[model samples]
Target: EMVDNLRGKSGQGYYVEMTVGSPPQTLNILVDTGSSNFAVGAAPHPFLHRYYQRQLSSTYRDLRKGVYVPYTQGKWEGELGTDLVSIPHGPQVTVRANIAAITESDKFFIQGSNWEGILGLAYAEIARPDDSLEPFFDSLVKQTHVPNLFSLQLCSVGGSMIIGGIDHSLYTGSLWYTPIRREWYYEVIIVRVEINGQDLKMDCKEYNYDKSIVDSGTTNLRLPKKVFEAAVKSIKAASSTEKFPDGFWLGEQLVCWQAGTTPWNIFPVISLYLMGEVTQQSFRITILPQQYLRPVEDVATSQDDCYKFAISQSSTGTVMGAVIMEGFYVVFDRARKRIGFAVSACHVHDEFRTAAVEGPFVTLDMEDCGYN
Candidate 1:
């Protein structure tokens, strides 16, 4: 079992250190559950960061392919290679892993960026064309002495990514397990939604559309446009004020609330009805007030003292991102084809705490993962 400390950047991004090569070139990598390719460097710029130089490693083997990864912000194009990968804090477990070193990249990979590259946790099917390669987690499970399960304990400052085992101390209660419908992503079905205590009345077609992707890489919960509107409307209708003085639109799908407002009084309790294998049996993930109200920077003021609601409108896929995840401990059990969720200790505080609370204990088995 390997346990390493994870760093959360700007309260929106989370990263972990990955060591590659024979002598071990440690690179700070952005941990993205939304992507699959593990590449380093952005463009030929030497200032980008310290990257994987094949010449430095005796274990390096070139697969001779162009790897291109287009993300939500930028894209990276590079060459694929394989080498030994390890974690600094873990046991002496160095597993052979495929990696990429970018020859070209976008502005998102600018100099001084905190992350050198991205370590994707998504399935191999999501990897780049001709670059479909097994990720580190797969190697950890198959070759190294590790389990098929890994848990994400993300917070504002410091967290830990426990590989091959469960960290009972980070969470409370039993694990609520859901099946992974597709191998492409850690996804699940959302049967319905509830605002406050009232169940939302979805149209025939809308009710049938319940698929969602749970990506820790995303910062906000992305719902369908209509559901997004209804959620905001529900918040307003539930609030004491006719119009919340703190509420403002940051962009097309972005919305925010003032710092001092009572989030629960202003925002409705959002209940996500997750579908189970059996019709009568279902599970619910409740989004609390503190989970929705986040301290974001005032773009106009350039100060990091503003608080706002974190939900957003997705033009395409419905994503359960970090905001909703802040209140839960999520487990990706690849071997059993299930994803588990449990209440996180992170929910009890506004900021990330380094403390750990002991836990004693904690599935939806579906086929499609709701991608269709």
Candidate 2:
């Protein structure tokens, strides 16, 4: 667990080592349940990052010399090509998958450098070598008709990156099962939440009770800004406090909306319509009351903004991280393609806890990561 908490260059992705007949290679693939692609280069391209590479195949080669992919972010721009990608866990019966190659900015920002390319793990509609991000998950759906859903608990860094599988070892107690809602993405129905012994507003009929992928690889919870405002309003209304003022930016974070230029208080409870509830017993951190004015370690920087607000620049709407996933038994039903959760029985070690469980556990379990 100590190892998991250690930071890595691309904090969001997971790496995997694979054998391509001749040798073993480690690829820094993204831990994207939202996506299903799992491609890697046959050879390392010169970009950046101190990751381990297992030479899996002699036939591996980079097609970028001839291929191209269109990408645009900030001052970053470019196209991607092709490479001999490898994966270790695929069933031997399944043929090698032809996936696209691309680069991402997560590494450049976190590690202060750029990545050679990225191995997307999302569901794309294109086929191998087609030059899109959809081939990975589509192959699984076509080949393995048994279960289309994949669940990720990401307990800590160095945790198991179980593909098409689950780690029963992560949980020390019983499995809490919830029904699945079959949609483009597997959804879990939440019944409600128990906060301070009170049942918060959770209506499956009025509110869309379906839940989508609980992805942390993303920086923000992607939801309509209106939904976010509503949730915040609910908290203030419940606490009997005035609306956040414009000057709250003076403050800070965790599962609770710590503070900002606005008069915000961390909402004590969040309700779901189907999969029971998510609570911050541990794993997730909330800013200590008035943590904003308290300079951490007697120092301050713009980065302190991370500790100063409940939402990040990447946030969209309501995407739960450690605040919701930690201390909970989440099940990704491949058969039904649904995500469900139950209260976790194991006591998550405090030292193991970071900003959220998603950060460290993800770093630990995936390749291309280690204690710096």
Candidate 3:
């Protein structure tokens, strides 16, 4: 589960330590709400840390099925099967789940990765092959009768994924929720974008070009093309001069400053507003310099702080990834068909503590605030 605290220098992979099969094989599975397949590398590859030796498990059963799932970055093909999965992170339950013993991959397994597989925490609808293939989280809840939700607290560089319940101790303040909008990938309604409290004023549906989702497997805060251009455009218009170039806004270059120089003042706070639980109400989630500025250590020999621009354009829709999620205790409450957030307890140490939640502000009428 080591992507080195799930932050900078190490890459963006949040994993959970679990056991698989009868004798219990050690598996650090990457936890993702964006997918549904509980897949592991079955065949050996030099770079992959560990492949699941399914042949060694006495209770392993092969379903004689094949699946190919292509992701936003990489793709993999495997045979589908089921086995006992023990999740020790929560109520401590053991249940059988569908798993893909990945025989091959394309860029899915890179050198230095600590995960052998990915545990999809999403519903079965988007499951490869078909919707009937029960998702791992679905199997876990039905078999164990635990709570219907799971919580994630990604503290910039270190956090935990608690199964079946929210560790109420990990967060502060009241947990406000927004409707899931759909069952697919923790989809949410992001109706507006504001820079320094000023609205970009685009059509709400443009923000949801396809659909908006909150995904843990993803690392960037993706915006729809219009919204993406609008943000960088407005940012440059308000803050600095021609010093802000297009390549930087395109996320092609690194923004760096001398050690302790801190160029954050030149950037405005970015706020994304999502429709809240109550109709016509919206909540603004603010991303200060700390949330989007990813710190890098190896860009230069001198003592300079280099940060990669984390926002990008998305065709499918807007996505709120760990860049924004790391600021709060996010709950994927499938039971309620809503996602909730609260100030994270780890904010004390990860003290760029500026990502905040504000307002139940009444918004004006719109044509269709959702994907149509």
Candidate 4:
């Protein structure tokens, strides 16, 4: 079994260390399952202090052309190359894989950012340049004696990304599986949404698109505009305060509240019903108080009353981001073309601690993770 434990930056992003070169230059990369590409720093972002340099590696083979990789926030361009990349967990197996030496980037990658590049875990079809490149995982599974299965434990505190095996102790109940709707992403059909044990009064019937993409790269839960509006309205009604603060848009919707009086105790728990038509299987994903209430710092004061929910309004399809994925063990079964989910044993609000000291994968003790 192969595994790579991931670390979180405060509560922003998850990163893993990878070696890319003959001698191996360790780089901190963001672990994203939403996109597929092994592109490194090419952008002039202030935080990109180090990037891939072909001349530094003896095994580097240049593809001789620039490739454009775009995302929701920005795009990057880099010269594609091949090299020997190695990961630290389970096995130190090395494989000759495609690598992108980024030359240009956008402001989306912030300054002093913990991650240097992105390790996309999505399917090859979504990759650019006619999907000719093989992702790190694909190459690993093909070249090595590894299985085509991976699992992710994404909590705000800390979690991990497994390459060849699943940690049974991470979750409590039996695994629930759902057929993938598309190969490009870990997409699944969400038959219904229940809030506080009651059905949220929104149309579950098929519309323009009725699927939800489970993306860990994204920080918040995004739903259709109408559904989002209704959800926000319900939230407002449930709040103990008489009036909500003015809404602000930071590419996504955000609203702040006074520090001492958050309505988290009374806030309703949301459950997503997945794949009820065919498999008749479903799971309950509860959004914990710590998972929903995000803290914002103020320059003027040290007190933290400014808190907000990590949910937003989207014009298109729904996306269940890391915020809602907390406390859940998610598995991506590429061989079977399905995804699995089980309730996790991790605490939602544990202070960020590096699990690297524990080696590749750390088994969670129920009591240590706040479970009785």
* Maximum-TM-score candidate: 3
Model 4: which ten-residue window has the lowest total lDDT?
Answer: 353-362
How do the residues 1-372 of candidate 4 rate in per-residue lDDT, one tens digit apiece?
333378775446687778888778887788888888887774456677776666788998998877888876567878888899887754568999888888877654656666788888888888877677788789989999988988888762467788777888777766777677788767776655656657665555331144578888877788877777766666666654556554532223344455566556566566666652143434445565566666655555434465556777776577788776767788888888888877776645333311110111112221111001
Runs in model 1 lying further than 4 Å from the true structure: 1-4, 42-49, 110-113, 130-132, 203-210, 240-264, 297-304, 349-371
**Model 3, range 185-228, lDDT digits (tens) per residue?**
88888878889889899888898888998888887888888888
> Model 2, range 117-213, lDDT digits (tens) per residue?
3444443432233435345545555665424544444441333334455556655444545443443333443233333224444332222322333
lDDT score for candidate 3 against the true structure: 0.80
Report clash pairs, candidate 1. 174-362, 175-362, 177-363, 178-364, 179-364, 181-369, 257-308
Q: Which stretches of candidate 4 lie above 4 Å from their native place? A: 1-4, 42-45, 205-210, 240-242, 248-261, 276-281, 297-301, 349-372
Error of 3 at 155 (Å): 1.2
Ranking by lDDT: 3, 1, 4, 2
Relative to the true structure, candidate 3 reaches a TM of 0.93
lDDT of 4 at 96: 91
Instruction: Encode model 1's per-residue lDDT on 123-217: one tens digit a residue.
Output: 88887764348886777678876878788877636566777768888888767776787788676776657788686665422422444778887
Steric clashes per prediction: 7, 45, 1, 6
Supply the TM-score for candidate 4: 0.85
Cα misplacement distance, residue 211 of candidate 3 (Å): 0.2
In model 4, which residue pairs have backbone atoms overlapping below 3 Å? 42-102, 42-103, 42-104, 43-104, 43-105, 259-305
Question: TM-scores of the models, in the given order?
Answer: 0.84, 0.55, 0.93, 0.85
* Residue-level lDDT for 18 in candidate 2: 39
